[PDB]
Amino acid sequence: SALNFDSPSSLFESLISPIKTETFFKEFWEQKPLLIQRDDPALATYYGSLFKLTDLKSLCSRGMYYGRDVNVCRCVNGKKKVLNKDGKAHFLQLRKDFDQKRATIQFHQPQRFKDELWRIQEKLECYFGSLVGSNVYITPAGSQGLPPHYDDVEVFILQLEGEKHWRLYHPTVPLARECSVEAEERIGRPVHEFMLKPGDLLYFPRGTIHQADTPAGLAHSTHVTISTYQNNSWGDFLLDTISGLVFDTAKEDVELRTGIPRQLLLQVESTTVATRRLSGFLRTLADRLEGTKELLSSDMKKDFIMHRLPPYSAGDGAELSTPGGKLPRLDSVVRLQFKDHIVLTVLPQEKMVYIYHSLKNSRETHMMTEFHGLRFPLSHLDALKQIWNSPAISVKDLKLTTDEEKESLVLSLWTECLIQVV
């Protein structure tokens, strides 16, 4: 049951155990909710170490701001009443609004301070290839922090402290791309109703309408909601790809650069000629796509690599800044490192291929002309593919005209701590 941090895959596998990943993606992922109830006292203990109400004591001493780091709320009348003060958040004030006013506390991106949640979410970003944020929700006994609603992300909920009554409803907007509160009268009857206890994990796709409340008693409820896949649909990837095609058009190709007919925006009906012209561009683009594969610019790739968490580091990020071991020579064999933290793309006298990585990304700003990378001549692309796909490859086998650029290519990647001499 213990989380295995040997790899992204092993982590996710353990995270959902005893459920197999093959089953998760074939029947649950983006389809329906998944409740994983366990009777593992050790796991329940581990979950409790992820985050607890008292951690805010140390956190607030660091200095935590309302809105930015913490939010105080409470559900009245199907709406969320905010009890936020303007400025720094003091643990005593929060405790007051919590125990006295029965308000729910919501901490934003705890991974910025908690090393375990960082280690977890970072491995998940690698596994999914998408940003992974999280919000901590602390609700006092016999109360409810939020009204029924649904979010725009895929979520993995881990019950840290106490129990909580959950009710899930059929989605009004399947796999929604936007969040929205719903009227208690328009959601119908709960499709799923259950109690989450420490050590339990709950997954449900974006669009899933839900609402939870802490049962009467003394013990409060604490859970962390780990979310991912925001704006990561085929529609998003489609627009991303088309934008790349449209704006990365050669200097000698001007059709897409010509102007639309004058007053077209003033028309009360899509002209038949403009529609025909548009359909023509789309079909052409379609053919251009399946035709000669090539690397295209992608804002989604850039957005991901620029805002994701850097590799987990027990102590100082020494291994992330200064390369180690021996320098790669033309006779040695190398293995790429931090592979899931690297992306290859192109920019909007030869063409160049760009390599970006997140080894030097800031953990403190996670989810809260300034981002450069490594430039390489397009002629090196096939060589980069060799390294990317190989478990261990010899510098000599790189597909480059000269042996100098082979030692140059590897050295360049070694200095950034991306290559290890196997």
Binding site: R68, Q106, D151, V155, T225, Q230
Partner: peptide, 8 residues
């Protein structure tokens, strides 16, 4: 405006 602040 989302109730879950995935990205601030």
């Amino acid at each position: 405006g989302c109730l879950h602040h995935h990205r601030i």
